[PDB]
Amino acid sequence: DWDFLPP
Amino acid sequence: GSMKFVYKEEHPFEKRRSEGEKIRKKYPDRVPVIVEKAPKARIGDLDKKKYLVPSDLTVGQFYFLIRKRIHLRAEDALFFFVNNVIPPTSATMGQLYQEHHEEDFFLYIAYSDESVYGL
Ligand SMILES: [Zn+2]
């Protein structure tokens, strides 16, 4: 659900 | 005029504060950020609104990882807003979170192509 930025 | 988010209207406060407490308790080195396009903003869209961003990144570096996600066209500008204020690009995301997090434990940032919120 959560997008990591940066991965 | 004042920071109005759709994510706050789609999910109640018990629910958000509980997700925020957990996501802080799980990924401590990251801060949870909700990112939405400000009203009247003439600019591209974000697929996702939810981002775990490292505490050490500055705002400048963030303007940039987002600028890539939306990809601005010619002479589009990209500004951020937290509590109706453009965050200094020198500040970090950890300081911004500490100083501006809502009490659901999320940080809320609106983005616009204009330097004034909702214009
Ligand atoms: Zn607090």
> DSSP secondary structure string, B16-64?
HHHHHHHHHHH-TTEEEEEEEEPTT--S---S--EEEEETT-BHHHHHH
Which of B51, B48, B54 lies closest to B30 in space, CA to CA?
A: B54
Residue B93 near residue B22 (C-beta atoms within 8 A): no
User: Residue B33 forms beta bridges with which residues?
Assistant: B51, B107
Distance (Å, rounded) from C-alpha B116 to C-alpha B119? 6
Chain B residue numbers touching A2 (CB-CB < 8 A): 23, 32, 50-52
Buried b (16+ CB within 10 A) or exposed e, B41-63: bebbebeebbbbbbeebbbebbe
Resolution for the entry shown, Å = 2.3
What contacts B39, CB < 8 A, 6 or more positions away?
B4, B118
Radius of gyration from C-alpha coordinates of chain B: 14
**Method underlying the structure:** X-ray
Residue B36 near residue B114 (C-beta atoms within 8 A): no
What is the number of domains present in chain B?
A: 1
- Chain B, 57 to 96: residues with Cβ < 8 Å from chain A are 65-66
For residue B77, the SS3 value is coil
Distance from CA of B53 to the nearest CA of A (A): 5
Q: Is B56 on the interface with A (CB under 8 A)?
A: no
Q: Is B23 on the interface with A (CB under 8 A)?
A: yes
Q: Hey, what are B25's tokens? A: 């308790």
User: Residue B34 forms beta bridges with which residues?
Assistant: B50, B108
Q: What is the CATH number of the domain that holds B48?
A: 3.10.20.90
3-state helix, strand, coil in chain B (%, to 5): 35, 20, 45
Residue B77 domain boundaries: 1-119
Which of B23, B26, B63 lies closest to B43 in space, CA to CA?
A: B63
